[PDB]
Design a protein around this nucleic acid. Structure first.
Lengths: 113, 66, 722, 178
DNA sequence: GGGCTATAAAAGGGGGTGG
DNA sequence: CCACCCCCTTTTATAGCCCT
C-alpha cells in the first residue's frame, strides 16, 4: 500500500515520524490478516475463487461486528454503481441505415473539399 | 486504492484467485476499521498505541512485532 | 558499523540497478576497513545470493570475493562421476498441482555448499556464483581456514547432466544455473591434478538428449585452452553440425570457429551451405555458420564462393535479424562482384538501422555502369509511391506497402536515396535519356556532377502536365500556398509538395544563389541539405562556383534563428576562414549569435588559433555557449584558467569550469573555500565547489604547460597533507 | 485520401493438437509464469520481438503483443520451436489473425455530442464514465473509439484491409461532426 | 509513473440459473 | 445434467483527472 494514503487519513498536535512509519506497517499487516482468514473461508466452502460473501464471514469470525455492518452497506452502494454503468431493424436493415450515413457524409465532404 | 489491495492479495501463491467484488469491499472496510482504532488511541493520549492494544481484547491480535 | 547498515538496506530496498551498483562498489572498496564485522557482512550477503532478482546474486557474489583476502581454502577435490535419475528444475513442483540461521562465520560456507543442489534454481545459480568468486581470489589468501566440500566436482557433474532448466527469453537459449556451474568447473580445473574431466565432457556431445549436449558444449566453451586432444574434439564438432536442435549447431560452429580447421575443411562447407539452402523461416544457427565460413575463406585464400551456392546468400540482406545482416557484409567485404553489388545498394535504400548500412556505404565508396542506371530509376520515382517488387531483388513488407512508407515518412525515404547518391558521385557515371516528379531534382545534380568532371525556370504549369505528384493536388490551393508563402493550409498535399517543388526549383537552377536561400528554410529533410552543400564545396575547390550573395545571407540565417543553413557550414567549414568573408565577420555584431550555433565545426581543427579573437569577444559578452566550444582545446582552456584564477567569476565558473578539463579543478579548491568562509557569494561558491570535490581525484593531464602544470602539482600535494 | 492509420497490436490463434503438460513447461522455462488458481494457462514472453503468448492445455495457443502481421506469425513459429525443444510433439496446424488494434491521429478536434446524436443507436457516449464514444460499424465488423483530442483507435478487424476500408468510411463522418 | 474507466479477439477453468 | 452466460487474464493504443 502507499504510505501517503494512510498518512493523510491519520493526520485529518503533530504525529511522530517514527509512529508514521509504524502505523503504515500496522496498516499493511491488517490487510494480510483479513486476507489469510478469508483464504480459509474460501477453502471451507470448497470454492477456488475468493467470494465477497466468504470475505464477510471472515470479518465476523475475527471479532469485528461494527466493521461487518459497514461492509454490507458499502457492497450494496457498489452494486448500484456497477449496474448503472431497441432499434427494431435487423442486422441487414440496420446495415442499410449506416451505409446511407457513410454515403451522405462522403457527399457533404466532397462539397467542402 | 482498489488495485493496491488486489496486487498484494494475488502476490501470495496460497491465495491464488480473488474476486473483483471481494477486493473492492475489503479496500473500504480495512481502511475504515484501522482509522477508527487509531483514532481511539489518539483520544487516550507512541506509548499510547501499545496501551490501546492491551485495553481492547479485539486489538490484542495486532502489535505482535516492532 | 552504521555505514554497513546503510549499504545492505539500499541493496534490498532500491529499485534501480545503477544505485545498487555504486553501493556494491563502495562496500567492495572499503571492505578492508569493515573487516571487523565479517559475520554480519556474510549474514546480509547470503540474502543477496538467495535473492529471486538475478541482479542481486552477482552483487552478492562480488562482496564475497572482496572478503576472500581474509580466508584460505582447501586443495582436497573428489573427482567422481555418478549418474542419478533426479532432475533439477526451477522449483519443488509442489507450488502447482530448510535454511539455517547464519550468525557464525562457518555457517555461511556450510549453507552455500548445500544450496548448490537446492530445489529452487535461483538458490543454485546464486551458490555457483558464490563459489566462482571464492576461487577468483584464491591466490590472495589469508590465515583463517575454510574447508570447501570435496564433493564439489560430483555436485557440478550432477548439475550439468541432471538439471533440465533453460531460459528461452531470446532466440539464443541459455541454461542459467548450468552455465554458472560450467564456469565454476573451468575456474577450479587448474587446482585439480591429472583428470579425465576434459575427455568426459566430450562424451556429453554424443548424449541422446540435447540438454546434456548443451552442458557439454558450454563447458568446453570455458575449458577451450585446457584441451590437449584438439584432433579428437574437432572430429565430433564437425558431426555436431546439422543437428535438429538449433542451439546445438550455434554453439558447435562458434566453438569450431576458435579451433583451426585444415584437414577436413571441405566436409565443413557441405554442412554450412546445406543449412542456408534448407530455407527455414526462423533460424538462429544461420548467423554462427556464416562466421565459420568467413574463417575458411580468410585462413585459406585459395578458395572462393561457388556460383550455384551464391544464390543462397541473397535473401540474407533482407533478414529481419540484424546479427545476420552484420555477418553478410563482413563476409563479402574483400570480394568485389556485380552480383552482390546490386544487393549492397538495396540495404542503403531499405534497411532501417544506420549501423548496418554504414558498413554497406563504405564498400560502395571503395563501379559498373549497369547498377548506376538501375538505381537511378528507383531514386527518380515518387516518394509517396512505395518501391516495386520485381524491380528489387530483396523483398520486405516495409518500404513496399502503401501503409509501410507512412511509418518511415517522406524525410526517411529521401535520406536513404541521398546516401546512395553520394556513393555514385565517386566513380564514373554514364548519362541516360530515361526520366520520370522528384526525377528532375536528382538528374539535374547527376548532370551537374557529370559537368564537374544550367537551364532556367520554365512555366509553373509545365511541371503539372509532366509530373504525377503535382497532377493530383489542386493548383487553386497550391498557388495560394505559394503566394503566402509560409502560412499552412487545410489540404494534406499542399505542405509536402511545396517542399518537393522548392527542392526541384533550387536543384535545376544549380549553380544558383537566389532559389537556394528559400530551400534551406522550408526543407524538412536534413540529409538532402548535406548532399546539396556537398556539391557547392566541390565547385568552390575547382573554382567553378562564385557564391558571396548566398554566403552573406547564409551567415544571417543562423544569426536570425534559421537552423537550416547549419547543414551548409558543417560541409563548408575551415574553407570559410580562408575565404575573404572571414574579414567581414570581424566587424559584424551578429558574430556572437552566429558562433553560438556554428562553434563546434571550427573548434575541431588546429585553425582555431586564427579565430582566437572570438574567444576574447566571448570572454567579454560572457556567452557560455561560445566559450564551451573553445574549452575543447587545451590552449584556449589554459588561457581561460589564467583569467579565472586572477579574476574570479563564480556565477560564470559553474557553467564553464565543468565543460573544460578536470585537471585544472584542484587550482580552484583553495580560492573557493576563502569565499565560503568570508561569506562572498556563499550560495553560488558552495554550489560550484560541490562540482569540484567529486572531480578532485581526476588524473592530471601531462599535456598542460609547465606554467600551470607545476601549479597543479604544488596545489594537489598541499591538499594531500590530510 | 488523407493519412494512413498505424497499427500497434496483433492477436493470433495457433493450434498444436497435443496434450501439453502445463507444470513441466512452467518448471523448465525461466521466461514462463504460471498459477493454476489465478489462470489455467502458462504465460511465456519473448524479448525479440516483444510478444506474450498464453499456452493452454490440449495444444491451444494465443499470441499477443506483436506490432506487425508477419511478426505475429514469426513469433508463433518461435513459440512452437520452444514447446518442441521440451520433448512435446509440436505441430503448426493453423494460424488465424483474430484482432488488429490500430491508432490514427487527425489534426482537427471532434465534438462527440453531435456524432452521438446522428448515430444514437450505434454510439453510447458518457462524459465522466469513459472519455470517448463506443462507435460500432456493422460491416466491416469493427468497433472504433473516437476521442475529443483527435486520436482514434480501431479494433476488432480480422483482416488488415478492413481497418483501411473502415477509416475511409469514418473520415467523412468525422468532418461533418467538427 | 501508474490507477480509474472502455473496446476487440482468442482460450478454459470455475461458478450461478435454466430446459 | 449439460447448456448458457458470467467472471478471470493477456496485450495494445487512446485520455483527462488524480495521486505518489
Amino acid at each position: 500500500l502507499p504510505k501517503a494514503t494512510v498518512d493523510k487519513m491519520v493526520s485529518s498536535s503533530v504525529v511522530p515520524k517514527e509512529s508514521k512509519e509504524i502505523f503504515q506497517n500496522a496498516c499493511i499487516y491488517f490487510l494480510n490478516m483479513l486476507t489469510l482468514e478469508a483464504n480459509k473461508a474460501c477453502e471451507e466452502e470448497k470454492k477456488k475463487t475468493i467470494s465477497y460473501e466468504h470475505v464477510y464471514k471472515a470479518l465476523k469470525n475475527l471479532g469485528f461486528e461494527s466493521y461487518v455492518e459497514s461492509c454490507m452497506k458499502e457492497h450494496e452502494n457498489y452494486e448500484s454503481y456497477i449496474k448503472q454503468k431497441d432499434s427494431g431493424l435487423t442486422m441487414e436493415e440496420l446495415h442499410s441505415q449506416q451505409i446511407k450515413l457513410f454515403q451522405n457524409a462522403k457527399l457533404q465532404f466532397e462539397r467542402s473539399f | 486504492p482498489i488495485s493496491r489491495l488486489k496486487r498484494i492479495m494475488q502476490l501470495n501463491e496460497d491465495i491464488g484467485k480473488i474476486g473483483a467484488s471481494v477486493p473492492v469491499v475489503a479496500s473500504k472496510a480495512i481502511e475504515m476499521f484501522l482509522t477508527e482504532i487509531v483514532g481511539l488511541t489518539l483520544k487516550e493520549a507512541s506509548e499510547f498505541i501499545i496501551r490501546a492494544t492491551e485495553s481492547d481484547p479485539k486489538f490484542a491480535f495486532l502489535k505482535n512485532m516492532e | 558499523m552504521n555505514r554497513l547498515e546503510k549499504f545492505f538496506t539500499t541493496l534490498n530496498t532500491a529499485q534501480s540497478k545503477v544505485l545498487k551498483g555504486y553501493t556494491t562498489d563502495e562496500l567492495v572498496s572499503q571492505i578492508k576497513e569493515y573487516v571487523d564485522f565479517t559475520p554480519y557482512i556474510l549474514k546480509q550477503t547470503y540474502r543477496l545470493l538467495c535473492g529471486q532478482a538475478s541482479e542481486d546474486r552477482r552483487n552478492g557474489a562480488r562482496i564475497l570475493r572482496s572478503l576472500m583476502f581474509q580466508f584460505k581454502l582447501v586443495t582436497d577435490f573428489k573427482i567422481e562421476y555418478k549418474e542419478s535419475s533426479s532432475i533439477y528444475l526451477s522449483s519443488t513442483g509442489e507450488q502447482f498441482n530448510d535454511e539455517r540461521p547464519i550468525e557464525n562465520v562457518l555457517d555461511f560456507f556450510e549453507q552455500i555448499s548445500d544450496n548448490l543442489l537446492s530445489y529452487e534454481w535461483y538458490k543454485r545459480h546464486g551458490a555457483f556464483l558464490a563459489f566462482a568468486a571464492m576461487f577468483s581470489e584464491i591466490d590472495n589468501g589469508g590465515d583463517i581456514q575454510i574447508r570447501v566440500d570435496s564433493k564439489l566436482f560430483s555436485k557440478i557433474y550432477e548439475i550439468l547432466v541432471t538439471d533440465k532448466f533453460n531460459d528461452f527469453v531470446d532466440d539464443r537459449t541459455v541454461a542459467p544455473v548450468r552455465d554458472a556451474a560450467a564456469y565454476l568447473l573451468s575456474r577450479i580445473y587448474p587446482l585439480i591434478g591429472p583428470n579425465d574431466i576434459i575427455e568426459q565432457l566430450v562424451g556429453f556431445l554424443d548424449s541422446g538428449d540435447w540438454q546434456v549436449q548443451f552442458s557439454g558444449l558450454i563447458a568446453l566453451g570455458y575449458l577451450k585452452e585446457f584441451v590437449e586432444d584438439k584432433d579428437g574434439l574437432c572430429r565430433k564438432l564437425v558431426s555436431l553440425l546439422s543437428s535438429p536442435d538449433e542451439d546445438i549447431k550455434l554453439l558447435s560452429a562458434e566453438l569450431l570457429c576458435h579451433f583451426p580447421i585444415t584437414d577436413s575443411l571441405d566436409l565443413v562447407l557441405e554442412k554450412c551451405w546445406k543449412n542456408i539452402e534448407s530455407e527455414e523461416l526462423i533460424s538462429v544457427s544461420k548467423t554462427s555458420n556464416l562466421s565459420l565460413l568467413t574463417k575458411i575463406y580468410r585462413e585459406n585464400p585459395e578458395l572462393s564462393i561457388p556460383p550455384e551456392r551464391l544464390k543462397d546468400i541473397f535473401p540474407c540482406f533482407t533478414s529481419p535479424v540484424p546479427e545476420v545482416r552484420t555477418s553478410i557484409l563482413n563476409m563479402v567485404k574483400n570480394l568485389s562482384e556485380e552480383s552482390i553489388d546490386f544487393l549492397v545498394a538495396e540495404v542503403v535504400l531499405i534497411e532501417e538501422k544506420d549501423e548496418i548500412r554504414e558498413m554497406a556505404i563504405k564498400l560502395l565508396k571503395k563501379l559498373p555502369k549497369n547498377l548506376i542506371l538501375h538505381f537511378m530509376n528507383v531514386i527518380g520515382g515518387s516518394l509517396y509511391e512505395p518501391y516495386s517488387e520485381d524491380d528489387f531483388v530483396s523483398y520486405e513488407d516495409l518500404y513496399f506497402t502503401k501503409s509501410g512508407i507512412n511509418v518511415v515518412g517522406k524525410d526517411e525515404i529521401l535520406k536513404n536515396r541521398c546516401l546512395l547518391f553520394e556513393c555514385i558521385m565517386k566513380s564514373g557515371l554514364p548519362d541516360l535519356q530515361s526520366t520520370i516528379t522528384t526525377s528532375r531534382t536528382f538528374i539535374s545534380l547527376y548532370r551537374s556532377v557529370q559537368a564537374l568532371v544550367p537551364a532556367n525556370i520554365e512555366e509553373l504549369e509545365y511541371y503539372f502536365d509532366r509530373c504525377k505528384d503535382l497532377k493530383m493536388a489542386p493548383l487553386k490551393e497550391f498557388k495560394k500556398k505559394l503566394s503566402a508563402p509560409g502560412i499552412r493550409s487545410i489540404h494534406p498535399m499542399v505542405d509536402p509538395l511545396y517542399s518537393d517543388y522548392t527542392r526541384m526549383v533550387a536543384s535545376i537552377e544549380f549553380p544558383g544563389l537566389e532559389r537556394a536561400t528559400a530551400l534551406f528554410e522550408v526543407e524538412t529533410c536534413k540529409q538532402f541539405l548535406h548532399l546539396f552543400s556537398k556539391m557547392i564545396t566541390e565547385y568552390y575547390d575547382a573554382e567553378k562556383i562564385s557564391i558571396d550573395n548566398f554566403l552573406l545571407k547564409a551567415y544571417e540565417g543562423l544569426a536570425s534563428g534559421k537552423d537550416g543553413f547549419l547543414s551548409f557550414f558543417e560541409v563548408f567549414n575551415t574553407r570559410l576562414l580562408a575565404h575573404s568573408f572571414f574579414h567581414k565577420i570581424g566587424s559584424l555584431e551578429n558574430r556572437l549569435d552566429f558562433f553560438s550555433k556554428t562553434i563546434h565545426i571550427y573548434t575541431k581543427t588546429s585553425q582555431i588559433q586564427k579565430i582566437g579573437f572570438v574567444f576574447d569577444d566571448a570572454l567579454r559578452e560572457k556567452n557560455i555557449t561560445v566559450i564551451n566550444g573553445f574549452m575543447r582545446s587545451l590552449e584556449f582552456n589554459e588561457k581561460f584558467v589564467r583569467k579565472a584564477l586572477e579574476d574570479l567569476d563564480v556565477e560564470l565558473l559553474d557553467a564553464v569550469l565543468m565543460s573544460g578539463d578536470h585537471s585544472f579543478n584542484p587550482l580552484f579548491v583553495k580560492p573557493l573555500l576563502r569565499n565560503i568562509s568570508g561569506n562572498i557569494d556563499r550560495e553560488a561558491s558552495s554550489k560550484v565547489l560541490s562540482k569540484v570535490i567529486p572531480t578532485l581525484g581526476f588524473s592530471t593531464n601531462t599535456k598542460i604547460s609547465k606554467d600551470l602544470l607545476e601549479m597543479i602539482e604544488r596545489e594537489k600535494k598541499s591538499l594531500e597533507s590530510l | 485520401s488523407g493519412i494512413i492509420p498505424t497499427l500497434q497490436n496483433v492477436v493470433a490463434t495457433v493450434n498444436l493438437s497435443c496434450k501439453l503438460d502445463l507444470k513441466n513447461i512452467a518448471l523448465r522455462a525461466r521466461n514462463a509464469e504460471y498459477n493454476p488458481k489465478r489462470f489455467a494457462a502458462v504465460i511465456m514472453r519473448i524479448r525479440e520481438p516483444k510478444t506474450t503468448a498464453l499456452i493452454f492445455a490440449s495444444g491451444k495457443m494465443v499470441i499477443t503483443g506483436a506490432k506487425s502481421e508477419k511478426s505475429s506469425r514469426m513469433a508463433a513459429q518461435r513459440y512452437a520451436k520452444i514447446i518442441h525443444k521440451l520433448g512435446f510433439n509440436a505441430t503448426f496446424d493453423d494460424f488465424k489473425i483474430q484482432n488488429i488494434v490500430s491508432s490514427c491521429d487527425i489534426k482537427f478536434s471532434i465534438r462527440l455530442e453531435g456524432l452521438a446524436y446522428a448515430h444514437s443507436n450505434y454510439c453510447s457516449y458518457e462524459p465522466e464514465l469513459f472519455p470517448g464514444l463506443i462507435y460500432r460499424m456493422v460491416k466491416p465488423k469493427i468497433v472504433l473509439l473516437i476521442f475529443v483530442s483527435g486520436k482514434i483507435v480501431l479494433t476488432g478487424a480480422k483482416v488488415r484491409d478492413d481497418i483501411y476500408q473502415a477509416f475511409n468510411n469514418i473520415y467523412p463522418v468525422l468532418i461533418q461532426h467538427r
